[PDB]
Amino acid sequence: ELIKPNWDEELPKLPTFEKNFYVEHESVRDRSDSEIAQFRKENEMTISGHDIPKPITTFDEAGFPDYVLNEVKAEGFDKPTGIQCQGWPMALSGRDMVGIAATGSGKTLSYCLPGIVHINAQPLLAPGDGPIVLVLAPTRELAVQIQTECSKFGHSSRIRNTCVYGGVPKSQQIRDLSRGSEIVIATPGRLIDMLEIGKTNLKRVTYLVLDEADRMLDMGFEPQIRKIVDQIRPDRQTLMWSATWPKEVKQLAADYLNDPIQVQVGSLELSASHNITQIVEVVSDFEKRDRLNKYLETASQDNEYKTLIFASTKRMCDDITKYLREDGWPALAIHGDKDQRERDWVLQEFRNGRSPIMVATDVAARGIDVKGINYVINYDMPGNIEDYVHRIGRTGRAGATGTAISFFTEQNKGLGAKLISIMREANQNIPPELLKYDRR
C-alpha cells in the first residue's frame, strides 16, 4: 500500500533528469521593466518569488522546439494568452509555481506544452516504467480537457497519454496503463486504486501538475493527493493551480513545492452564484431583436414574472422599449438622460407587477434592490466581465433560482474568453459555437 520511501537512501540511486529548456530570446530582455511591468499589470498579474522570468509576448519568444511551435500557432492565434506569456518562461525553465487564476482559466496549455518538452529530453519508456509527467485533476471533465491538449500537442512525438478517472471501465484502464503512457492524468481517487494493484508506478515521475488544487481538497481528495506526492521524488518540478486560497491550499503548496514562483492572474474570483442558469447565444446584432421576443415570451408565461433587460446605450433602451410596448409589452425604460423626477416610479411599479419588464443600462444599474427579478436578459453584451456578473447577480438568491440570457456577438470577442471561465466555474452548459473563444 503506502510505503513512503526515505528520499536520502533511494534518491541518490535514482537517475537524474534535466528540467530547464528556456532560451529567453533577447527580444524580451531587454524591453524593459516599465513595459514588462506595464504588461504584467495590464493582465493583473501579481508575481512574487525569486528570479522570476520576464514574460514572453509572442509564440516565437517562448523557447519552444518547432514540432510544437508549429502546432501552437497552427491553431490560428496571435500573441498567446497572458497566462501563457508569464507561465511558459517559468515552466520551461523548470521552476516550481503556484498560480492563482479562476477555475476555467487558460491554464492547461501553460504546463502541457513545457511538459511535452520535458518528456522529449529523456530516455524512452524502457519497459516496466510509468509516466514521466503526472497531472491531478478533481473532475473527470477537466481530466479529459487536459488529455485533449496532451494528444493534440503530443501526436507530433510518441507522446502517449491515458487519463484514469472514475466512473468508467476499470479494466480498460488497466489495459491503458498497461501500454506505456508518458503522460498520466488522474483523479486522485482512481490513481490510488491503480497504485495498490500496482498497474502503474510513479518512480519516473519528474514533472507534477496539480490542477484546480483548491477544489481537489474541497471534495476531500487531500488524503489521496498527499500520499501520491510522497511517492514522487522531491527534486521534481511541481506546478499547482488554484482559484481560491484556503489555509490548506496554502499549506499544500508549502509542503510539496520547492522555491516556487507565485503568479496570480485573476482577481480572487467572484461567486456568480450557482442558483442561476445561464443562456448564451452567439448571434448578430441584426437578428437580435428577433430572439428578444422568443425569450421574453418564454418568461412571460409564468405569473408573476419580472424580467430585466440591459442594452449598451440609453438611446437603445428607448428604441428597445418603443419597440416592445408597441406590440403590447408593459415595458418602461430607465436611464439618467431624462427626468430623474419620474425615474423612480418605474420601480414602485416594478416590484408589484404593474410593469414586469424594465429595460436599463449598466450606468443606470446603480444601487437599486428590487430583487425578485426573474429571467434577466443582456440584449447588448457589456464590455467587461465584472458587470456581466453584476448584471446577472440580481436573480435567484432568496428564491434561489433564476435564469440569465445573453446576446453575444463578434463585438464582444475579447470577452468571449473570460465569459466561458464564468460558466465552468458554475458548471453550466456552454453553447457549442461560443466555445471558439476558449483560449487565447
Swiss-Prot record:
There is a cross-link at residue 418 (Glycyl lysine isopeptide (Lys-Gly) (interchain with G-Cter in ubiquitin)). Residues 88-263 form the Helicase ATP-binding domain. GO terms for cellular component: cytoplasm; mitochondrion; nucleus; ribonucleoprotein complex. It is found in: Cytoplasm; Nucleus. A motif (Q motif) lies at residues 57-85. It is an enzyme of class 3 (hydrolase). Residues 291-438 form the Helicase C-terminal domain. One of its GO terms (molecular function) is ATP hydrolysis activity. The modification Phosphoserine is found at residues 32, 34. Disruption phenotype: Results in defective assembly of nuclear mRNPs. Keywords: ATP-binding, Cytoplasm, Helicase, Hydrolase, Isopeptide bond, Methylation, Nonsense-mediated mRNA decay, Nucleotide-binding, Nucleus, Phosphoprotein, Ribosome biogenesis, RNA-binding, rRNA processing, Ubl conjugation. Its EC number is 3.6.4.13. A motif (DEAD box) lies at residues 211-214. ATP-dependent RNA helicase involved nonsense-mediated mRNA decay and ribosome biogenesis through rRNA processing. Associates directly with chromatin, correlating with transcriptional activity. Required for assembly of mRNA-binding proteins YRA1, NAB2, and MEX67 onto poly(A)+ RNA. The Q motif is unique to and characteristic of the DEAD box family of RNA helicases and controls ATP binding and hydrolysis. Present with 33100 molecules/cell in log phase SD medium. This is ATP-dependent RNA helicase DBP2. It comes from Saccharomyces cerevisiae (strain ATCC 204508 / S288c) (Baker's yeast).
